[PDB]
Design a protein around this ligand. Structure first.
Ligand SMILES: CC(C)(C)c1ccc(CSc2cnn(C(C)(C)C)c(=O)c2Cl)cc1
Ligand code: SF4
Lengths: 427, 353, 180, 117, 95, 166, 160
């Protein structure tokens, strides 16, 4: 009843904010998130379905990741507007509804239910935040139009709005293309990625954390249900990884460079969509969500609005633990042993080779080797001389969160044979 | 339209044309009657002049209205300025055919009504939105923000109460189970006078129709003595006549629909005569509404919106939910009679403090 | 919205121009503009004999004019020490309170009509006619009556004035209590 | 249900209404002195600026209309339950009641924050 | 089939609008045209495959109303005090 | 088209314009209350066809200059008069409007015919409401084309047709 | 059919061309309302009647009313101000605009479907049980979405 917990807690808190101080509302949101997470743990391997709502390994794992991101990003937000939390809750539930169904139209409703609150969530009033949010809104509504005509052409190709239907030839290809348009757009895959740099630079840092973890998690969760063709997948991966890393080289700003890196990271993730393994992909997204939440909590402690690369420099002298954790996250996102990001990347590569697509994989790997440039210019910068840099060294809440995230990354890198056994049915 | 026949299309055109010209002559003579009834209300007596009964003053007024220098204002939109009255009039005339004036054939052979759509109340609601459309569109087209703010008042208030109309109209559908007015009327024949079951909704419908240009928000608005209203202040010969005409047709359409749905739209237990009882109830609602016209003040469109949103709509939706409880469980129909009688006693006995 | 509620419109009684500084439906502040009726009584009065200026006195505040009539009369009298007989003074205060009644009737009729409903304008204004009839009985004029004089009043009351006035004094308390 | 004939009669109704309205507009326009003047065509209110130069109007109208779009969507969803009820039983009533209560919670929020603004 | 070709053509037209229009609100209107064309296609295919696409299109209109409400709030927020809503005036955040 | 070019049609439209006189309220001074009293519940200008009262100038034909026309109101009234439909009539109510009245000074137009084409003049101070009805009856039979002056001349139906307005 | 069918299709297509062409926001939106009326007629012709009535009441009565409200609060109609026209965008986008149709035509060209089903009118009488039923969860999700959008817009404007 995790859906029940989420919906009930959100609806109650909505009015309760009139009687509750913002701190109490934050505590209650935290409680609801933790309760849903625990309910997921107790239902490990407990498929539970009501209608089109279908809880499986994918829904379970990815909504767990989304709840993780939501818990963390709420940890930072202390503003005296309960709304800045309610939407969070709302968004969370939407992304759950994104992963827990096969119904295309319900997929659209969930996409709106998660995207709408995030749009307003980027309103620190900072003018560039509004520019980014407007770009996000217009591109998202366009992609929603595309996704909608995709669901229409799907119903044209089959009597049900559920994936898995037999499907015709060219018409099913066209409907699949129209769905993949919006879904990859939400997945920060090229050639639909352009919103990502602008939004990551403009939006407040913890919001960018929340987005870059939970949004992408739920998007790939829904994507695994699709029977994506190999050729369209080749185009998406090639363009995404190439443009992501290449444009990432030239960036002087931390958030935008990280946006391009996240484009490259989605390009890496999309390989499991070749087989729809959904186990390797769950592992990958676990590692990625942890590392990104870590890095972005660091960026928040630096400056919420904007953080340039030089701001990252000298982090170790300011905070050694934060510098080390940022190094660990940069490496795990580089996919290097013995870190869990390397296992997730390797598992995706195994799925891709098992699908038999060679050139795409080779180009992706060469571009990943290219990625080491900025992965290092971030990770190694931990030790540099502190130049002018905004530094407010956070609470111990986020410090312990960052520490545990890095520890989980390195542990699952050394011993992935612990959780990966339970990313399938989940014994 | 399971049980109701169909006249030939040429008869449809004939009947529509007769309904339009009847609405014309009717609103003219009703302007006379409103003037004279207001007069009786305010001691002063009406036009014992040009008639005898005044019933030739409307012709003089119309004949002046034409030849009255229909002017195309400069600094104004060439097209919308002239076009909007067509919308306001056309989409006002219609939505009157559905009202049953008798059983089939009681039109001396063919049909009392014009059209008997399966989904009627939605038709009425849709074309009701278009009257507000024409109103505020004309308000804009003048290019005078003086009238523009009044047009905005019009649209805001009428749209709020227009929403409330839906929550009012929900409840009787549960009992009837059909969206054609004639089935509702036959129901009112069998079980009897639906308002006995749903008086509160009736109120929130009735009061809602009071906001729909009858009077008392009276922030409809008119130019007189306040921030000028929309749909006037720049039109001279016929278009102004078209706006007043459409507003009065909306008035009579509501004053006929209210007896149709909740009360006994004709369907009389006594003498069961096709037309006369319907016309008499229409005139009765006219007498009450004119009593209100020359008896109650304005509501300022601020208190009016607050009242519409906080009072009418929650109450209407609550009544719908209660009626839905009774219908879904479907055991009695008496429970609704009891609860409605209690509700009316509440809304009435709470006054005499 | 620096909105110009112009002179005489919309039906702004007492021809007046208002520049409503306003954003929305509130009222920030209204800048008034008057002077649209300045006729120059303070000037034209300098050129009429003391007897004649009684013709200029009522027409300025045309609702409660007898206050004008009486104030001007008293000022001139004090200036030259004239004695008003008690009957004259009593008639003056009667007419003063009567025009007060007519003025307040017109004021509340205009106010009630100004925003809201029209009806009660008539009944109260109705009484004004009756009151005017009363005045037409004594002064032969509806308003702008030229009756008062420096010494006192122009001429005597007819026998017909008192009964009509008693009839109105009988109907008025019930009428006013009805409005209240 | 209903035969298509009544819908054709509906279109005929619209055609007749439009025919009469356009006829009335032509009667009004053709019959008149038609001697417009430079001042006659002036908008209103004593020289210029009935309103004239004013800044943008209050968002209150916007808020009311947005409220209206959402809550008329609500009513549009409430109608199918209004017609088909007995087949939906207590289950249908309870589902529609939960839906109604969600949107009524939205209303209670906007009310306790209020819209005078 | 005529209706589905009409849906495709209207979708293309609304895309032309979204790309061409300089102001946000006209872009938003073009998006409305695109979504409604999609719903038209859905109604056709529901007539073909059994009436479920009708409920689909209804839910779609509700979704469009929600996204319109939010988009209008955002459009108001950014360009109420600011000058003409044209999105070409906001280019601070670059690659 | 101007209400002309058929012997019956011009009679008909003149009849209509005569009894359908729709007043345009322009209250200026103390004449205004004796104007309104021509509508109170002793004596109503609400029978001949003047019950309703469109304050708008875009919708009313008779302009009742009730009170002294102060000069600062003259140009405004000017445009207000031009903001009337062309089938319009202008009555000059009171002495102060018709003549200079007793206010023979720098402040008041001594005859409103200067700025607006006057149809009917009405002396009095204030003109008894029934005299205002008499003036509108005078205007009535004028716009019917049934009015003659002391010199024997028939007067045109609509004054303000003969002025090169501009 | 085809006699009035082609006419309705021309009305639809031309109205879309207008709403994407005209620089007057009010005129574009009103052409779009004409489009929606034609579209409700088409829906009725497709035996979906309730959906057409809702398309009229919801879109026209509510949404574009507010559209017009906003552009009247904020004139904004002639958007071509502060142009940065980027002249190349006018033809090139049209090209792309055509392409997004052609590939769709490719999916639909040479495609004939079983359009033989007796909907018996898309009335809510029959549409309730699908809406309240197989779709009841989707309806509840949409309602929650509506509440979330309300809170979003309110907290978004919320001057304080
Ligand atoms: C509708 C009626 C005919 C009753 C009407 C006609 C004209 C007006 C506006 S002229 C006007 C009105 N009242 N006053 C007082 C003396 C009461 C302040 C004025 O000074 C002026 Cl100038 C208002 C109502
Ligand atoms: S004629 Fe007499 S009543 Fe009329 S405005 Fe002049 S002073 Fe006043």
């Amino acid at each position: 009843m995790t859906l029940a917990i989420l919906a009930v807690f959100s609806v109650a808190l909505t009015l309760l904010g009139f009687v509750l101080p913002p701190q109490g509302v934050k505590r209650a949101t935290l409680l609801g998130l933790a309760l849903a997470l625990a309910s997921l743990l107790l239902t490990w391997g407990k498929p539970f379905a009501f209608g089109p709502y279908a809880v499986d390994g994918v829904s379970q794992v990815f909504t767990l990741l989304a709840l993780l991101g939501a818990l963390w990003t709420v940890g930072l937000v202390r503003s005296g507007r309960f709304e800045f939390y309610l939407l969070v809750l709302y968004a969370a539930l939407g992304m759950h509804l994104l992963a827990s169904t096969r119904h295309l139209l319900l997929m659209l409703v969930a996409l709106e239910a998660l995207s709408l609150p995030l749009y307003a969530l980027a309103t620190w009033r900072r003018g560039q935040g509004l520019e980014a949010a407007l770009k996000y809104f217009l591109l998202g509504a366009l992609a929603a139009a595309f996704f909608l005509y995709g669901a229409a052409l799907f119903y044209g190709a089959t009597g049900s709005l559920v994936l898995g239907a037999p499907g015709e030839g060219p018409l099913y290809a066209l409907a699949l293309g129209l769905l993949l348009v919006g879904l990859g757009f939400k997945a920060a895959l090229a050639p639909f990625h352009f919103w990502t740099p602008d939004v990551y630079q403009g939006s407040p840092t913890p919001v960018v954390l929340f987005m870059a973890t939970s949004v992408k998690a739920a998007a790939f969760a829904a994507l695994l249900r699709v029977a994506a063709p190999p050729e369209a997948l080749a185009l998406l991966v090639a363009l995404s990884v190439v443009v992501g890393n290449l444009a990432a080289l030239a960036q002087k700003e931390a958030k935008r460079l990280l946006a391009y890196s996240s484009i490259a990271h989605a390009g890496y993730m999309a390989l499991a969509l070749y087989t729809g393994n959904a186990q390797a992909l769950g592992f990958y997204l676990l590692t990625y969500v942890l590392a990104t939440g870590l890095a972005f909590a660091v960026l928040s402690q630096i400056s919420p609005d904007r953080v340039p690369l030089e701001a990252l420099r000298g982090l170790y002298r300011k905070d050694p633990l934060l510098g080390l954790a940022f190094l660990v996250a940069m490496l795990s996102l580089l996919g290097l042993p013995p870190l869990a990001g390397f296992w997730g990347k390797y598992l995706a590569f195994a799925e891709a080779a098992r699908a038999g697509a060679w050139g795409v994989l080779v180009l992706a790997l060469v571009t990943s080797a290219v990625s080491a440039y900025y992965y290092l210019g971030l990770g190694l910068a931990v030790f540099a001389r502190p130049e002018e840099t905004p530094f407010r060294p956070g609470p111990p809440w986020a410090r312990a969160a960052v520490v545990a995230a890095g520890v989980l990354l390195l542990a699952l890198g050394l011993l992935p044979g612990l959780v990966l056994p339970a990313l399938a049915a989940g014994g | 339209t399971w049980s109701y026949p169909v006249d030939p299309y040429w008869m449809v055109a004939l009947k529509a044309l007769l309904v339009v010209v009847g609405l014309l002559t009717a609103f003219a003579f009703m302007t006379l009657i409103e003037r004279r009834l207001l007069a009786r209300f305010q001691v002063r007596m009406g036009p014992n002049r040009v008639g005898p009964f005044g019933l030739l003053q409307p012709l003089a007024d119309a004949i002046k209205s034409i030849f009255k220098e229909d002017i195309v204002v400069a600094q104004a939109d060439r097209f919308l300025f002239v076009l909007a009255p067509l919308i306001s009039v056309v989409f006002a005339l219609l939505a009157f055919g559905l009202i049953p004036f008798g059983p089939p054939g009681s039109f001396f052979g063919y049909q009392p009504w014009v059209i008997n759509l399966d989904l009627g109340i939605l038709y009425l609601f849709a074309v009701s939105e278009l009257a507000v459309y024409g109103i505020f569109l004309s308000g804009w087209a003048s290019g005078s923000k003086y009238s523009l703010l009044g047009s905005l008042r019009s649209s805001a208030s009428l749209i709020s109460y227009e929403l409330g109309l839906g929550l009012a109209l929900l409840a009787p559908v549960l009992l009837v189970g059909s969206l054609n007015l004639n089935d509702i009327v036959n129901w009112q024949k069998e079980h009897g006078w639906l308002f006995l079951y749903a008086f509160p909704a009736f109120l929130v419908y009735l009061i809602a129709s009071m906001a729909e240009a009858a009077r008392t928000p009276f922030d409809l608005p008119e130019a007189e003595q306040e921030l000028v209203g929309g749909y006037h202040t720049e039109y001279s010969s016929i278009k102004w006549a078209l706006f007043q005409m459409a507003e009065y047709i909306h008035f009579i359409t509501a004053s006929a629909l209210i007896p149709t749905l909740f009360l006994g739209g004709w369907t009389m237990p006594v003498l069961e005569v096709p037309y006369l009882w319907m016309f008499l109830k229409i005139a009765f609602f006219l007498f009450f509404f004119i009593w209100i016209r020359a008896t109650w003040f304005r509501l300022r469109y601020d208190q009016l919106l607050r009242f519409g949103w906080g009072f009418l709509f929650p109450l209407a939706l609550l009544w719908f939910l209660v009626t839905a409880l009774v219908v879904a469980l479907d055991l009695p129909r008496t429970y609704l009679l009891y609860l409605s009688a209690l509700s009316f006693l509440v809304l009435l006995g709470a006054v005499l403090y | 919205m620096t909105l110009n509620v112009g002179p005489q419109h919309p039906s702004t009684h007492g021809v007046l121009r208002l520049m409503v500084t306003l954003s929305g439906e509130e009222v920030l502040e209204v800048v008034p503009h008057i002077g649209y009726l300045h006729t120059g009584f303070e000037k034209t009065m300098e050129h009429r004999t003391y007897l004649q200026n009684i013709t200029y006195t009522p027409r300025m505040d045309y609702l409660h004019s007898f206050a004008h009539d009486l104030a001007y009369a008293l000022a001139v009298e004090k200036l030259l020490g004239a004695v008003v007989p008690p009957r004259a003074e009593t008639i003056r205060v009667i007419l003063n309170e009567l025009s007060r009644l007519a003025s307040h009737l017109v004021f509340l009729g205009t106010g009630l009509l100004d925003l809201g409903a029209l009806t009660p304008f008539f009944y109260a204004f109705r009484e004004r006619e009756t009151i005017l009839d009363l005045f037409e009985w004594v002064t032969g004029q509806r308003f702008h009556h030229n009756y008062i004089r420096i010494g006192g009043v122009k001429e005597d009351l007819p026998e017909e004035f008192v009964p009509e006035l008693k009839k109105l004094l009988e109907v008025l308390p019930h009428r006013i209590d009805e409005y209240e | 249900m209903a035969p298509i004939q009544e819908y054709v009669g509906t279109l005929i109704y619209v055609g007749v209404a439009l025919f009469i309205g356009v006829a009335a507009l032509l009667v009004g326009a053709l019959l008149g002195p038609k001697k417009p003047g430079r001042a006659k065509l002036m908008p209103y209110e004593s020289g210029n600026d009935p309103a004239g130069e004013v800044k943008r109007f209050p968002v209150h109208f916007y808020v009311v209309a947005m409220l209206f779009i959402l809550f008329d969507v609500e009513v549009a969803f409430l109608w199918p339950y209004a017609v088909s009820a007995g087949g939906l039983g207590l289950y249908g009533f309870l589902g529609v009641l939960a839906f109604t209560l969600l949107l009524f919670v939205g209303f209670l929020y906007e009310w306790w924050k209020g819209v005078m603004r | 089939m005529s209706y589905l070709l009409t849906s495709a053509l209207l979708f293309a037209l609304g895309v032309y609008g979204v790309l061409t229009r300089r102001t946000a609100i006209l872009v938003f209107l073009s998006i409305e045209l695109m979504l409604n064309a999609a719903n038209l296609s859905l109604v056709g295919f529901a007539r073909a495959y059994g009436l479920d696409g009708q409920v689909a299109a209804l839910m779609v209109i509700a979704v469009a109303a929600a996204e319109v409400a939010v988009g209008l709030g955002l459009i108001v927020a950014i360009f109420r005090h600011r000058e003409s809503t044209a999105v070409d005036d906001l280019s601070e955040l670059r690659g | 088209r101007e209400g002309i070019l058929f012997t019956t049609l011009e009679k008909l439209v003149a009849w209509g314009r005569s009894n359908s006189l729709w007043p345009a309220t322009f209250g200026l001074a103390c004449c205004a209350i004796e104007m309104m009293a021509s509508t109170d519940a002793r004596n109503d200008l609400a029978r001949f066809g003047s019950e309703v009262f469109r304050a708008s100038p875009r919708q009313a034909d008779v302009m009742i200059v009730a009170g002294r026309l102060s000069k600062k109101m003259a140009p405004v009234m000017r445009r207000v008069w031009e903001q009337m439909p062309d089938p319009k009539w202008v009555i000059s109510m009171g002495a102060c409007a018709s003549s200079g009245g007793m206010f023979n000074n720098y402040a008041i137009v001594q005859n409103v015919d200067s700025v607006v084409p006057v149809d009917v003049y009405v002396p009095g101070c204030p003109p008894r409401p029934e005299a205002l009805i008499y003036a509108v009856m005078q205007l009535q039979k004028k716009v019917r084309g049934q009015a003659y002056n002391e010199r024997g001349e028939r007067l045109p139906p609509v004054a303000a047709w003969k002025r090169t307005r501009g | 059919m085809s006699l009035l069918e082609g006419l309705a299709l021309f009305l639809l297509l031309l109205s879309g061309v207008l709403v994407v062409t005209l620089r007057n926001a009010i005129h574009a939106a009103l052409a779009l309302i004409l489009n929606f009326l034609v579209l409700a007629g088409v829906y009725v012709a497709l035996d979906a009647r309730f959906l057409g009535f809702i398309q009229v009441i919801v879109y026209a009565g509510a949404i574009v009313v507010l559209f017009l409200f906003v552009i009247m609060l904020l004139f904004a109609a002639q958007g071509e101000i502060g142009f940065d026209p980027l002249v190349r965008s006018r033809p090139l986008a049209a090209l792309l605009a055509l392409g997004v149709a052609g590939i769709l035509a490719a999916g639909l060209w040479g495609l004939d479907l079983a359009f033989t089903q007796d909907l018996k009118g898309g009335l809510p009488q029959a549409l309730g049980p699908l809406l309240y039923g197989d779709w009841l969860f989707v309806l509840l999700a949409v309602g929650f979405l509506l509440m979330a959008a309300t809170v979003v817009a309110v907290a978004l404007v919320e001057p304080g």
